[PDB]
Each structure stands twice: as structure tokens, then as C-alpha cells.
Homo-oligomer: A and B are copies of this chain.
Amino acid sequence: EVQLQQSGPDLVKPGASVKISCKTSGYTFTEYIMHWVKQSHGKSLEWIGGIIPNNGGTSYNQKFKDKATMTVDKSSSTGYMELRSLTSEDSAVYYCTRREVYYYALDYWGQGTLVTVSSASTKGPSVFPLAPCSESTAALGCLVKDYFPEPVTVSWNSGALTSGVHTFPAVLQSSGLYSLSSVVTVPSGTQTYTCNVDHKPSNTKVDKCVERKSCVE
């Protein structure tokens, strides 16, 4: 019923500006207040501000009085929040939330929007298969490497396969580019195994079949 769908990730220029999107559904919009929350990589949660959609009025955290700026289009059931002159300190996940009053609390959260701030230009990833050589448990995966900035999605069979999957946290490399691994364990007809990488900050989507070579002469 109730959803808050947020603008995809962002790489941003150290000095630029960015408007995040929060598209709401499953409630009448103006009958609830919208707050925004920041989460820095240390995973502390700060309250940024609040907006009343019915009206358009706001109450900013004074930490961000200069940086953030919130608004709403009543029509599209959508609030926004614009960071000004971004430094590296703006590099964070940004949730949008709804206030319920029973009293007060934030009873519905966005999934979040990762913002990065850097000169370094975008680079989408190379995706290579991981397949073994030689149990009723074999493993495949694929290797998503040298990309920037941090967020990639990884899927298997377009969402079909959830059991067995482990997508690992990325590692920053000496290069300054990230690199990730995704692996599946399986039971041992020959179902295929396709890993779907989506790196939105470069509009890079890749579907790589991982070939298990069973046949013999």
C-alpha cells in the first residue's frame, strides 16, 4: 500500500547541487508530514528537516539550514530536498520518511539515496564470470570490478533466484575504483545462471551468463 520511492544514486561535483526525489503512494500525501534523514558512512542518523505538504511550510535542522532545501509537488505526490555547495561531508545515504501521529514517529522510510561527492569522473564496471574447474553444492558467481561511485545492484535470473546468493561488500582499491563479488551456491535440467549488474551512475546494465562446462569428449 504505502511506499516512498527515492531518486537513484548520485555522483556529484565538489561544489555542485542536487535535488533528491521522494515519490509517495498509498496515502493522501497532504495528510502526513515528510522528514528527511542523513546517514554518514559511520552510520550515524541525523535529522535534516521537515515539510508539511498541504501547506509547504518547513522546519530545518540548523545543521543543514544552508545546505538542504525541501519542497513538494502536491500533484505528483512527490517531495524533494536539494543540497547546495556540496563538500565531501555530504557523501551519505539520504532517507525520506513519513510522520505518523498515534504520538509522533517515522513509520515509513524510503530505501535511501546514496550521494557521493568527488571530482573523479564516473566509471561503469567490467563484469567477469566466476566458474570453478573440476558435492550436491557447487558455486558460481561473477566479478564486478573497477567501477565508481559505490552503488551497484546485482541480481540473479532477473530476480528469480534469491536462495544461495551472497553479494559481497565492495572494496576500494589502490586505483580508487571499487570492486565486488557475487556468488551463488546451487544443488547440482541444466538451469542457466545469469548475473544482472546495474550501475545506475554510469547507466551500465550487464547480463552475464555464467557457463558451467559439464560436457566431456
Contact = CB atoms under 8 A, between A and B. Distances in A.
Interface residues on A, range: 10 to 19
A153 interface: no
Contact of A217 (B131, B133, B217): B133
Contacts of A55: none
Nearest to A213: B213
Contacts of A213: 131, 133, 213
A154 B215 CA distance: 27
Contact of A215 (B129, B133, B215, B217): B133
Interface in A188-217: 211, 213, 215-217
Nearest to A215: B133
A217 B133 CA distance: 6
Interface of A: 129, 131-134, 211, 213, 215-217
